[PDB]
Design a protein around this ligand. Sequence first.
Ligand SMILES: Nc1ncnc2c1ncn2[C@@H]1O[C@H](COP(=O)(O)OP(=O)(O)O)[C@@H](O)[C@H]1O
Ligand SMILES: [Mg+2]
Ligand SMILES: [Mg+2]
Ligand SMILES: [Mg+2]
Lengths: 186, 305, 320, 320, 228
Amino acid sequence: SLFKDDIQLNEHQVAWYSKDWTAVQSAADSFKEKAENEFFEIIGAINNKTKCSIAQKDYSKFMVENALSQFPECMPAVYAMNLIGSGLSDEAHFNYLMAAVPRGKRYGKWAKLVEDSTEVLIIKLLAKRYQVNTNDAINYKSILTKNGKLPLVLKELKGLVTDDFLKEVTKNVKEQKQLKKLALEW
Amino acid sequence: ITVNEKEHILEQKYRPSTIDECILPAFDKETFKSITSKGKIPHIILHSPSPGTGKTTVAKALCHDVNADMMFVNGSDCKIDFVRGPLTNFASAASFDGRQKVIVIDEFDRSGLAESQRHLRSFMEAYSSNCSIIITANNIDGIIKPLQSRCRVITFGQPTDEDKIEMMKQMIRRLTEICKHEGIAIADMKVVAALVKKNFPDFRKTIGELDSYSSKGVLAIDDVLESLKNKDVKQLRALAPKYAADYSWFVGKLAEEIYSRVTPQSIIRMYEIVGENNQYHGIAANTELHLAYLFIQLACEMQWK
Amino acid sequence: SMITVNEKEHILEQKYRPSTIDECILPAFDKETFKSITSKGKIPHIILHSPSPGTGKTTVAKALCHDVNADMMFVNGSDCKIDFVRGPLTNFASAASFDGRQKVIVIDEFDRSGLAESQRHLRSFMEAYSSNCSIIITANNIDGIIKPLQSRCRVITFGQPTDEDKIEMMKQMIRRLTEICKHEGIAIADMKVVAALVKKNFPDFRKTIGELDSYSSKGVLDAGILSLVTNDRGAIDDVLESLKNKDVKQLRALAPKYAADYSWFVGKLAEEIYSRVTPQSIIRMYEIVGENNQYHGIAANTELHLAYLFIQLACEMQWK
Amino acid sequence: SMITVNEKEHILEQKYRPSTIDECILPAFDKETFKSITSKGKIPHIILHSPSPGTGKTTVAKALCHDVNADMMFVNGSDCKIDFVRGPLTNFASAASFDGRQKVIVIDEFDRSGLAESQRHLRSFMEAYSSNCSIIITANNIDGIIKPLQSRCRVITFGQPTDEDKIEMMKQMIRRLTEICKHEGIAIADMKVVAALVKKNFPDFRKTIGELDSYSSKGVLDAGILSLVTNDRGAIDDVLESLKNKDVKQLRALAPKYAADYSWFVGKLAEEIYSRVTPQSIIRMYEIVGENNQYHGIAANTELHLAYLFIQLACEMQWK
Amino acid sequence: MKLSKDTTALLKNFATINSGIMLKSGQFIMTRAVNGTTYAEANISDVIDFDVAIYDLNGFLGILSLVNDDAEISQSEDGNIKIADARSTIFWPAADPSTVVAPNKPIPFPVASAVTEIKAEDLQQLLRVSRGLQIDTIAITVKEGKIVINGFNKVEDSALTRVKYSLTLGDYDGENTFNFIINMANMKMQPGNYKLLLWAKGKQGAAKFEGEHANYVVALEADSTHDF
DNA sequence: TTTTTATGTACTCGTAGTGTCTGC
DNA sequence: GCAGACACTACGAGTACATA
Ligand SMILES: Nc1ncnc2c1ncn2[C@@H]1O[C@H](COP(=O)(O)OP(=O)(O)O)[C@@H](O)[C@H]1O
Ligand SMILES: [Mg+2]
Ligand SMILES: [Mg+2]
Ligand SMILES: [Mg+2]
C-alpha cells in the first residue's frame, strides 16, 4: 500500500481493473445468496382457500403433496393424488387439492427421524462388509453387541471407513468426528 | 463340516460348503445333485419364500460344486451401472482357468432394481456361454417375467413329514458339532432339539438364536408398533420414509406382528387395511406417503391393549 | 440336421436358437409376412413385440438378417442411449456397405422408459438413413416405444396366434422338441409328456425348452415324468378345509405356500369353490377373487396379498 | 405420373413422399394457407405439429422449400444443441444466399425437453436473421416448444381435420393408394380393402402406407386380406348365448378360449352386446367391461380375469 | 495411389471446410462446407486412381502422417482403404458418397465485377491480427480509388463503424461504390498470394480467391451493399 | 410459520490438466 | 532444447425431466 492517495476503490474495481479473475470470483461469489422456494404460497393457498397465483410459477407436485401430508385431515386427498397423481396436469393436481383439502391451517415443522449416526455407521459398515441388506445388518449388530461385544468386528472393519463411504452417512464435520470415533474405542 | 476361520458371525462362518452339507427335502437335494451333475450351470432362480431356508447358501454352493468362478453381489447393490461396468467387465472376460463364470445376485426382488432387471434380458443371452446367473428371491413376482423365462425356477421348502424328522435330526447333530468347535457346552440334549423344533423351517434363525446364549459358552418393528398403540402422528409420519425402502418386506413383518398384538375383530380389519394398501402399492406415486396413509388408517381403527 | 446347433453353448434353449426364418415356429400369416420380406431382399423398419417373453422376437430379428445376408449390428436396448446413436450407430449407418448388403441395426429390448429421449433422436435418423439402413426393434411392452417410432415401423405382434395357429404351432414344436431329444441323447418313452410340455407353457417357447431340460433329470421321459409335468397340485384340500373352518393361524400359514404361482392357484380355487359353496356365495367369490386377481402384480408382497384373499373369503363365503 | 417416386429407396412409405405442396393431402384451409406462402415467394417462420405422427409435417417442411426454391438446411432436432446453433446455423444464416434464394433452416422433431436452452438462444437469433433466413419447425408435441418460439412462428396444427375434411381427405388417400398399387404391381381385387386401410389408421398417412406394404404379402388384396385388416376373427355367438342363459359351466369353459387376444375380444363384445341389451343395461356393460379392461395386465391369470367378466355380465345384464 | 506431403497438406486445409470429402478419379479435388458458406477446389500432383467417400478426412490425414512417404494407398479387396507402408499395413473406413457433402460440378465463376490482388505477406498480417484485435468481420470497399480492406469487431460495433484495421490492396480502376462484408469464419483458405475476383448482382453475390495451388470461393454476408 | 422421496438420462457451463505447435 | 501458447478433454456442479 504505497502512494497514500488512492480514493479507496471498492472490492470490485481493484479486481476488475487489475484483471485477476479469482478476485473477480470471490467478488461475484459474494452475491451467492440462494433460497427462493415460494412453495408455501401455493400450499397456503390450498389450505386457507385463497387466490391461486399459479401455472405462472414452478410447482412441485411432491413439495405440495408432501407438505400437506403433515396433517392427517388432508391424507385422503393427498393419497388420492398419489395413486392418481402421475398423469395429472401440474395444474390439475393443484385444482384437485384446492377442491379437496377442506379446512385450512398449518404451522411448519415436518417430521424427520432420530439418527444416532454412530449407529447409522455401524449398520452401513455391516451392510457393506457382508453384502447383506439393512434389516439383516440390524440382526447383526444385536448378536455382536450381545455376544462378542463386536469391538472386534468394529476393530477389523474400521480399516475400511473409506471417507467416501462417509459421504453417504452424514453431510458435515460431524462426519470427520466419526472418522475418528470408530478409529477409537475398540 | 466346514468352518471359515477368519469370520466372526456364526451363520456366516458355518455356511455349508457343498450341496451335501445343506439340509433340504427330497426332490430338492435330488434336483440339486442332478444339476451339478452336468458340470455347467444354466440360469437359475431360487426362492423360499419362508426365509432362512438356505437360498443364499445353496447358491454359493452350486457354484462351489461346479468349480465355478463366482462373483457374489448383493441385489440391493446391483444398480444399473453396476451391471454395466463390473458385471459386464466380468462376463465379457474369458478365464485363464477355463471355468464357468457365475453371478449370484442375492435377493434381487427389491425395488429400484426394476430397471436393472430389464438390462439383463439381453445380457444373460449375450454372454450365455461364458457365464450364467443365479438369482435369489423371497417373492418371485418381484422378478420380471422375461427373466423367469431365461431362468430355471426352482422353489424350495415344504418338506414331507419324513423330510421333517430327518432334517430335524440333521440340524441337531449339526448344532452339536458347532458347539464342539466353538467351545460352547451342551448341558441338556432336549434344549438342542427344542431349538430345532422351535423355529423349524428357519435354520438361519436357529443358528442366530445360538449366537445369542453364547456370551457364556453354555446351553425391529417395535418403533412403529409402539407409535401405533399411542395413536400419534408426528412419530408415525416420521417413520414412513424409513421403511419406504423395502415396502414388500415391511408390510409382511407388520401383518405378522400386529396379528398377535390386536383384538380378534380388529384382525379382520387390519387385513382389509394392509391388504388394500398392498394392492395399490406400485400404482402409488410417492411410496413414502402411501406408507403414511397406512399408518394413519391403522392407528384409528386398530384397537387393542 | 434340419436343426441349427450353436455348439458354442451349453444352455440348450440357446444352443437350439433357429438359424433361418423357416426354422422359427410362427403363426401362419407372420411366417408368410417375413418370407415375403426376405424375398424383396431389403428389410423395412420392424418392431417385434411379445409381451409374453420367449415367443421368437429376438430370434426372428437375427433370423431375418441372415436370410437376407444383412450386414448387421446387434445392440442391447438399455445400452442404446442417445450418444450411442449419435456416434456408433450413426457411423455404421453412414458407412457405405461396400459389398452391397442391406445394413440392419437390431436394437434388442428397447422398451425401457429411460430410453425415450434416445428413441426421439431416432425418429429423424430412421428417415435420413432409410435408403442404406433399417432398424429392427424388439420389445416386451410396446407402450415403451414412442408413437412416432411405431409409425415408422412395420409392427408385428407375437404370441397372439389364432385358434388355428396355436394348434399348428404346437404340433410344430412337438416335432422340434423330439428332434432336440434325438440330438441331446434324451430318450422319449411316452410322447404324451412332450405334448404336455408344449401345451403347459405355450405362448413361451423358451421356458418350454428349459422345462424339457429340467424334466430330463433322469435322461428319459416316461409316463412317470408325465405325472410331474401335468401335476400341479389339485391338492387345494388344505386351504378349502381351512376356509370352511374359518380359521386364520392355518390360512395365514398356507399363504406363503401358494405365493409361488399365484395365477395358477387362483384358477384352482375358483374351480373348486364354485361347486363347494352356496349359489349367492358364488356371485361373491368371483367378486372377491376377481378383484384380488386384478390388483396382483400391483401388490407389493404377494404372500400377504394372498392372505388378504383368504380372510376375505372365510368371512363372506358361507356353504356346506 | 402425377406421383413422386424417390427410386433411391425401397421402404415405400418413403419411396412415395410428396415432392411439392400440391401433392400433399391436406385440410382445405391448410393447403390454401401454404399455397399462399409459396406465392409470396418468401417463407415466414413456421411450426408444424401433429401430435399424431405421419400427418405430413416433415413432408410439408421439405415441400415448402421446394415450391419456393429455398436454399435449405435440414437438421435433426435432437442434434440441434446450442453450440450447433452458434456455429453452423449461424454461419449459414449470416451467409449471403448469393443466387438470391430464401434461406430456410428446417429443424425436424424439435420437441425434446433437452433442447429448451437451445430454443432459448434461438429466440433472439430468429429476430436478428429474419431478413435473410427463416425457420421451419416440426414437432409431435407442441408444449415442447417454448412459448416465445410459438410467438415468433405461424403455428399450423396438423391432423385435426373437420368432419368434412376427414371424409374428403380419406377419399383422396384411397385414390392415392390405388395409384401406388398401379405403380408397385400390387393388384386390387376388392376395393373395400383399400378403403378399410385408410379408415383404420386415419390420422397417420405413414403407417397407412406401410400397412399397405405388409398386407401385400401375396401381391393381391382380396376379400380375404380384408378379413385381417378389419380383423374380426369373430363368432361371439357362443358367449352371447351363454350370457343370455345366465349359466356358468358353459361360460366358465369359454373363458380359456378367448384368453388369447383379450384386447380384441373385449371389443367384439362391447360391439355386439350394445345392440342386444336394454338401454340402462348399456350404461352398466360399459362400467363392467370398461373396468375389466383397465385392470387387465395387472391381472395374474388372464383366463380367470376373463371368467370374472362373464359372471359379472350374466348377473347384471338384461334383455330378451 | 500415393500421397505427397504437398497434397496431404492441401487436404488438412479442406478439412477446415468439411469434416469429410468426396474425391473422384483424377488430378482434381473439391469440397464444400456443409452449410454452403465455403467451396474449395484444386488440381494436384499425386494422381487419384479410384473413387471413395471419406467421413473422417482429418483423422485419416492424421493416420497417413504415421507411414512413410512411399506408402501405397489402395482400395481394399474388402472395399475400405488399405494404406501399405513398407513394414506395415493400416486399414481405414469408407463411407458412402451420400453422407459426405459433395458439390455436383466444379462451380465456375461468372465474369467478375471488380478485381484486385493480395500478397502472401499481407494475408498473414490480417488473419494473425484478427485474433488479437478481435476482428470477426471484414469489408472490401474503395478508398481514394484504391481498394482497402477493413477489419471490424461485429460484437463491439454491430454497425461496422469503428474500423479497427485496414490494408490497402491496390488501385481501383473502374467506377462503382461497394462494401462487401465477409465473415472471418469463412476465410478457411491456406496462405499465399491470391487474385481476387468478386461479383455482385443485387441480392446476389460472391467472392472467389484464386490461389496458385487451389481456388477458394466464399459467401458474402447479407448486410453487404453495392450498385452493380 | 414451515422446506426435499429414488432411479435413470440429458444438456450446458466452468475450470483445470493434458497436448501439440510454435517462437530464443 | 525448452517454455509458452495455443487447442480439446473431462470431471464436477447445476439444472431439469419422467416413472415408481
Ligand atoms: N438347509 C440348510 N442347511 C444348513 N444350514 C442352513 C440351511 N439353510 C440355512 N442354513 C443356515 O443359514 C445360514 C445362511 O442362511 P441363508 O442361506 O442366507 O438363508 P436365506 O437364503 O433364506 O437368507 C447358513 O450359515 C446356514 O448354516
Ligand atoms: Mg441371505
Ligand atoms: Mg430377447
Ligand atoms: Mg418427421
